[PDB]
């Protein structure tokens, strides 16, 4: 994934664009992988990063949402492909005109496949009460997200923040899982980063964190941050957080074996016993 961050493959920030619908038996993510473009984070994101590494890719399907009396062309300068762009899977909704309002809306998506989906939506934490009155509008803001096993009723939290890459706002991306023939109804009066294409898991994979280069001539199975472990040895001193079909981490740095005899230079006492000595006379056996 290189400069893509593995949670961006369901959002599509401008470096994950070659990656939106991948399919892999080995996902690789890098230290420079920034999951976002607009600065922010995913809430409960280590549960989400542990779904995706063993998922075998993601097979996006449309959610069929249409939107009315509303603009959906929201972009920002921090997300660049050739111009001011946005995410590939999400929709920065806004107002129609800048200071009238945001009309109240409600949508719903019924899972109709066999597999469980992964929804991911977003709440936008603006910098002030002067920008949510110009992005979305006056009044309070509310984003209820409900299914058969779930409701949370999120809300933004504006305020002044430290800049990371020029902007002082955030976006938190939350996520649930729908089961077959369920629904999620989203009602929201603003401050919402709607999805446009939900995701369905394809198969199986593993996931590794690393910082070295890809080598398709080598054939290996146990992968850590500085590379790949390959032997039949049960114990490894190399890295404790080695994932895959990895050997077991240990503290000490050498453990041994033999083939045969304790050595004599020239539990019954046979090696140097009453036959007290050795040879170099015969040279095939012992």
């Amino acid at each position: 994934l290189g400069q893509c961050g593995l949670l961006g493959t369901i959002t599509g920030p401008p470096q994950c664009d070659q990656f939106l619908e991948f399919s892999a038996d080995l996902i690789i993510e890098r230290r420079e992988g920034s999951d976002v473009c607009y600065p922010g984070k995913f809430v409960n994101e280590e549960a989400l990063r542990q779904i995706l590494r063993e998922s075998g890719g993601i097979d996006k399907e449309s959610m069929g949402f249409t939107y009315n009396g509303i603009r959906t062309n929201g972009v920002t300068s921090a997300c660049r492909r050739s111009g001011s762009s946005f995410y590939a899977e999400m929709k920065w909704l806004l107002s129609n005109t800048d200071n009238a309002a945001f009309p109240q809306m409600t949508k719903s998506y019924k899972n109709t496949r066999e597999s469980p989906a992964i929804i991911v939506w977003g709440i936008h934490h603006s910098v002030s009460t002067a920008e949510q009155t110009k992005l979305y509008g006056s009044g309070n803001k509310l984003v209820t997200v409900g299914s058969s096993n779930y409701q949370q009723s999120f809300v933004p939290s504006p305020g002044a923040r430290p800049q990371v890459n020029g902007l002082s706002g955030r976006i938190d991306f939350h996520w649930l899982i729908l089961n077959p023939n369920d629904t999620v109804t989203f009602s929201f009066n603003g401050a919402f980063i709607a999805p446009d294409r939900a995701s369905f898991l394809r198969g199986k994979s593993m996931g590794i964190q690393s910082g070295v280069q890809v080598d398709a001539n080598c054939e290996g199975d146990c992968y850590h941050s500085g590379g790949t472990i390959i032997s039949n040895l049960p114990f490894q001193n190399i890295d404790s957080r080695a994932v895959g079909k990895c050997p077991r981490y240990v503290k000490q740095r050498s453990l041994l074996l033999a083939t045969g005899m304790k050595n004599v230079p020239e539990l019954f006492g046979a090696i140097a016993g009453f036959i007290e000595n050795g040879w170099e006379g015969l040279i095939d056996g012992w």
Epitope: Q18, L20, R81, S82, G83, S84, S85, A88, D196
Partner: antibody, heavy 118, light 107 residues
């Protein structure tokens, strides 16, 4: 409403220099989008050839990089291609555009049919 | 170079029919296709960007679809001004490519 206009004389002999010059009224080139030029064949086959950005960088078609120079000017609000080593095959219509790129090719122009002949 | 083989080159239909046509790109261009309406004698103009979104200004009965390798627009309720050559744009890599086009007539 954005509207952009080309200018240029309509004759060129092979291996000469004929320039293409696009002027944009009302909107600047420093705000961040790229500016492509697009080629139009007899038989309405099309190819792209290059662009200049808001940020002074160039990138061209990998069959044509030895032929193209794109530069741009601010007091005229203009972007500038001069195409050398021409051939009679290159009879085409050249569309200048505020090209959004990954959002497609947003604005277009009327386009000027220029002729290459002996 | 990523080739766009827009099939077929010619198709005619009646007013109110449904037509399904394929822009088939050679490699994976995940959501980056941008399709263009050429009137014969008038300039191309944008109708669909990012394979899904209507450029605001066009009437609503356009609906582009498909994803992946093969792509598809549909027109239900064909109208007499819909005589065009519908060009499609690859937008994953450099260089850009266009395609051969198609011809749509009133039968």
């Amino acid at each position: 409403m954005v509207q952009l206009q080309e200018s240029g004389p309509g004759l060129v002999k092979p291996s000469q220099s004929l320039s293409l010059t696009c002027t944009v009224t009302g909107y600047s080139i420093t705000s961040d989008y790229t500016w492509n030029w697009i080629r139009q064949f007899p038989g309405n086959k099309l190819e792209w050839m290059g662009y200049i950005t808001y940020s002074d960088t160039t990138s061209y078609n990998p069959s044509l990089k030895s032929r193209i120079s794109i530069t741009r000017d601010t007091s005229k609000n203009q972007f500038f291609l001069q195409l050398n080593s021409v051939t009679t095959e290159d009879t085409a219509t050249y569309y200048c555009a505020r090209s959004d790129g990954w959002y497609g090719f947003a604005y277009w122009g009327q386009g000027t049919l220029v002729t290459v002949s002996a | 170079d990523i080739q766009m083989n827009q099939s077929p080159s010619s198709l005619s239909a009646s007013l109110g029919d449904t037509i399904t046509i394929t822009c088939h790109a050679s490699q994976n261009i995940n959501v980056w296709l941008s399709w263009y309406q050429q009137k014969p004698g008038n300039i191309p103009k944008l109708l669909i960007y990012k394979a899904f979104d209507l450029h605001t200004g066009v009437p609503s009965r356009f609906s582009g679809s498909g994803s992946g390798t093969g792509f598809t627009l549909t027109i239900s309720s064909l109208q007499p001004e819909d005589i065009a050559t519908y060009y499609c744009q690859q937008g994953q890599t450099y260089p850009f490519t266009f395609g051969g086009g198609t011809k749509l007539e009133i039968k």
